[PDB]
Design a protein around this ligand. Sequence first.
Ligand code: HEM
Ligand SMILES: c1ccc(-c2cnc[nH]2)cc1
Length: 395
Amino acid sequence: ALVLDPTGADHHTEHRTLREGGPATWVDVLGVQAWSVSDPVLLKQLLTSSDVSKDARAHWPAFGEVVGTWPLALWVAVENMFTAYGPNHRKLRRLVAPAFSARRVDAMRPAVEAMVTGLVDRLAELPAGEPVDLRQELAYPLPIAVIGHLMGVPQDRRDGFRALVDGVFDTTLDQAEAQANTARLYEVLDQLIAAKRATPGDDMTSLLIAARDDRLSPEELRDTLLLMISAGYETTVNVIDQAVHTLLTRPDQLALVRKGEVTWADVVEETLRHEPAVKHLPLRYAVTDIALPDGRTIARGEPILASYAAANRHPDWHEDADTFDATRTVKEHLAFGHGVHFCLGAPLARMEVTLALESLFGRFPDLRLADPAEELPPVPSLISNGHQRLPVLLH
Ligand code: HEM
Ligand SMILES: c1ccc(-c2cnc[nH]2)cc1
């Protein structure tokens, strides 16, 4: 099996290495072997087939053995829509879906714009001439403010999730370290639940608690909250990171926006295709034997790893796929998945990034990297795709 680098040191080379194996390749993900699939046609078929599942408990025979030794166990051990199959998935997703409907996201625009303006205004107060780490001053705080408002996370409890959600995506942690991070996360989650139970509000956390106190099990409640909070605290940060970094390293693209040839939305869509926030998605399983394009077989019970980043650059899908081009007529990508599990937060994330870009470049037209010659290393993760820091000069 091809061993995927847990430190995510060079994902671009990784894309090529994986695609070198054809539509699918047997790989090793921190000790677990699975079929990495990067052919978008095949991936879309697998993602819409009744023969593929995200329910490890029901469809992965090795689950019982893996759960105690795999550092990424939390990704497949939770009990929420992320690990549900069929009717159970429809049920667990429908409970949260309402908060992310088209009408709801549109209704949140004013609040999100205000949050964006506040963070950008703050940047404007920073000492002129001194470098600013945009990842820490804008990319990270915006998604947190949005999810906090939507989920109803008390202000005094927001910082507590930061290091823990980071741990969820830290694929360099060993089993013991991952287990400790997970325990700490459930602890702050239980505390949040207790606080919201005592003082409910007009938010999703309160609605979920209400559903559990009515069905919804104790595990489904905390695990659904874990999913929603983690999704809001990480991932979007990387899209903002990548979009800004691209515009600062590819001036022609920013000029296209200023000329009115492409929109901020177009830039976000190309960023999602070219440098998606989630490179690989653990994990799926074959409910029955599945034939691969080369005659090989994904045996019943074997894992399937959706390799979205590599797939978004597949040469039969997009021409000159490795080049960032916001003018592309065909903008489809798999950054949010495909099918019933399609990212529930997609519309909100898209709005967050488009608004952030507009406000940021609108306020600082001379924004630029603090040091273009400085190499910005990637976040140490096989899953998350972002820079450890994004040093810029506002004026
Ligand atoms: C507003 C912030 C976000 C929220 C609340 C959110 C929420 C969710 C939820 C609830 C799911 C599970 C859906 C299901 O299994 O039915 C999900 C899945 C997913 N999300 Fe997000 N998400 C957010 C941002 C993002 C971003 C920025 C990306 C990457 C550009 C992303 C990528 C994905 C992917 C790849 C999946 C899995 C698709 C699959 O099942 O293969 N999400 N998200
Ligand atoms: C665990 C599983 C999924 C997620 C996620 C979904 N969308 C963004 N992050 C975060 C933690």
